Amino acid sequence: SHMENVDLVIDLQFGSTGKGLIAGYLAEKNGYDTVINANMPNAGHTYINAEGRKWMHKVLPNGIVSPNLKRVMLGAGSVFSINRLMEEIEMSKDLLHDKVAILIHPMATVLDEEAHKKAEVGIATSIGSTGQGSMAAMVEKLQRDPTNNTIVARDVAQYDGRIAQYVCTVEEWDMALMASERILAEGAQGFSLSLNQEFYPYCTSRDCTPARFLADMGIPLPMLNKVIGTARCHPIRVGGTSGGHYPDQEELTWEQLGQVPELTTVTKKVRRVFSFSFIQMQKAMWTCQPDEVFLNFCNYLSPMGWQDIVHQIEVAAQSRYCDAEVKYLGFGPTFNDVELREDVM
Ligand SMILES: Nc1ncnc2c1ncn2[C@@H]1O[C@H](COP(=O)(O)OP(=O)(O)CP(=O)(O)O)[C@@H](O)[C@H]1O
Ligand SMILES: Nc1nc2c(ncn2[C@H]2C[C@H](O)[C@@H](COP(=O)(O)O)O2)c(=O)[nH]1
Ligand SMILES: N[C@@H](CC(=O)O)C(=O)O
Numbered sequence: 001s002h003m004e005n006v007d008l009v010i011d012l013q014f015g016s017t018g019k020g021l022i023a024g025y026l027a028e029k030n031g032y033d034t035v036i037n038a039n040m041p042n043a044g045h046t047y048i049n050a051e052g053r054k055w056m057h058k059v060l061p062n063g064i065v066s067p068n069l070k071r072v073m074l075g076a077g078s079v080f081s082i083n084r085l086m087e088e089i090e091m092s093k094d095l096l097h098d099k100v101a102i103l104i105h106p107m108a109t110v111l112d113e114e115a116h117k118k119a120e121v122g123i124a125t126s127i128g129s130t131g132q133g134s135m136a137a138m139v140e141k142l143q144r145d146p147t148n149n150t151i152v153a154r155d156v157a158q159y160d161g162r163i164a165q166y167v168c169t170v171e172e173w174d175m176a177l178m179a180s181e182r183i184l185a186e187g188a189q190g191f192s193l194s195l196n197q198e199f200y201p202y203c204t205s206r207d208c209t210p211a212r213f214l215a216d217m218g219i220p221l222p223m224l225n226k227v228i229g230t231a232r233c234h235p236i237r238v239g240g241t242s243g244g245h246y247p248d249q250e251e252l253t254w255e256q257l258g259q260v261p262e263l264t265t266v267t268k269k270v271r272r273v274f275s276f277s278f279i280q281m282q283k284a285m286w287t288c289q290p291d292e293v294f295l296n297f298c299n300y301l302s303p304m305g306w307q308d309i310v311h312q313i314e315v316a317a318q319s320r321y322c323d324a325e326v327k328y329l330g331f332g333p334t335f336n337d338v339e340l341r342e343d344v345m
Contacts (some may be wrong), residue, residue, distance in 0.1 A: 004225040005080040007032070008185040010210055011233035012284035015190030016262075016271065018296040018330055020045030020062045022230055023186045024055065025328070025338045027063035033115075033179035035063030038075030038143060038216035041084075041132035042204065043112055043188040044265070048334040055092065056265075059085040063184040064095050071176050072103050072151075074166075077109040077206070077216025079137040082162055103176055106154035109137045113284045116140070127202045128242030130264070135205035155180050173218055181213065183223070187213040191284040192235075192246075202243025209287050229324060232297040233309050236262065239269035249277035252340025257300055281316035296330030299337070307345050 007026065011017050024047030027035060039045075039059060047055045047062040053061055059080045064072055074080065080243040089096055096102060116133025124131030149155040158166035168176070177183070187208065192199065194207040203296045206212055210227050233259060237243060245251065252273050262271040293313055298306035310326045317324035329344055331337045 003220075003222045005180065006183040006185050006219055006223045007228060007229060008187060008210055008213060008224060009228050010187040010213060010288050010290065011190040011193075012229045012231045012288055012290065012293070013190050013280060014192045014237045015043070015208075016236050017190070017230035017232045018231050018294070018333070019187065020047045020055075020057065020329065021296065021333060021335075021338065022228060022294040022328065023047060023184065024049065024061035024065045025335055026228070027066040027166055027184055028335065030066075030184070031068040031180065032063060032066045032182045032184040033062035033070035033075060035066060035069065035071070035075035035186065036075060036183060036217050036219070037061040037186040037188065038213060039186075039188045040075030040077075040079040040134035040138070041081060041203075042130035042134045045186075045188070046333065050335045052334070057088055060088045061184065061186045063186060065094055066184070069095060069100050071103060071180060072096065072098070073173070073176060073217070074104045074108050075217035076107040077104040078105065079111055079134050080108060080256050081111045081113055082156070082160060083113070086162055099177070102166045103168045103173065104153045104163055105173055106152065106169060107141075108153040109141045110111075110153055110156045110160075110163075111137050111149060112140070112150065125240065128238050128240035129309070130238065138205055152292060156271045169192040177219060177223065183219075185213065185217055185219060191288055192280055193309045197283070199243040204240075210289070211286070226291040227289060228294060229288055230296060231313060233278065233295065233301045233306050233334060234275065234297060235274050237272040237274070239272060242272060245274050246277035246279040248279045249275045259300055276312065278312055278316055282314055282320050285317045285322040285324060286320040290317070290324045292328070293317075293324050293326040294328040294330065294338075295326050295341075298329050299331040303345070305309075308344065310341065314321050324327065
């Protein structure tokens, strides 16, 4: 009868805050039986455990590292490459054992790598889109053409056997959520990337908010226990003409931060980096309303600098009626680098 059991990870900036790290960290600490996401191919999530084992996932939740893993769920809002999904499953087959059920929502979108990426070539330069086919795939799903049996996982399962064992029904989806003890819902992208945030058209193809991530994962609202918001000390955007920033922030350089230029690994496009925006935090806090915050890339600043950003985040939260507590701090890309805030300050 108790229902609040979903911990939803949401980005509070323009993405790449290390949601992949907090997902894997929380999965290992909290031992969720169900890990769920609604990812699109624009988002790649990296987790590195204490032993140095690395997971770079575009389809599978990073939370599959949970010691009590029972269910892996790919939301209806998912846009995925079956090839990639196959590699990710194979890569973690030790974790995705016989007693682990992988559930692909019947309406999850199958990425047509050639056609969908080709359709995004223009926005790949114009809005600095990742051009991974995410929206092109989503639009093909929205066409709702009864003659198109190649876009949703339910229809693709009938000719592509690779996903037939994973593709479930809507009732199976709802029951898997019902039967779950503790859920880790993994949000992707970033609050300010939301289609309905102010940087349109320099945004993604959906809102990157708790309400949209819960919707895209088919999670009933009473299931939400807590929202874990993620933030970087210096927010980033992808390279190119990727959009504007907030009035209280400035575009910095990697040389200015004294850091190794961050880039999207496949294309090697250098990420745009910005100073921390309090306005962004207020905007994110207002909509996202996190209960807990993970402040990452603290290793880019002095103790004074990131300690200041912690207090900023907490006051930006209080100002927008949000009781968010910076509970976790990131000092590197691995599990060992996630510190409890109360231990370092
Ligand atoms: N504190 C830290 N210091 C240095 N590198 C870090 C770090 N935290 C994460 N990283 C690395 O930087 C990148 C952070 O991206 P990750 O893929 O985890 O972010 P994310 O899950 O938020 C991406 P998305 O915006 O697509 O949702 C990865 O390459 C990760 O290994
Ligand atoms: N860091 C990051 N940027 C993303 C992600 N998804 C979308 N974006 C950004 C890149 C572009 O500036 C913009 C549009 O990209 P796309 O959603 O691929 O069309 O959103 C993501 O998961 N991570
Ligand atoms: N941009 C994501 C995904 C990728 O490039 O493969 C990353 O930096 O990991």
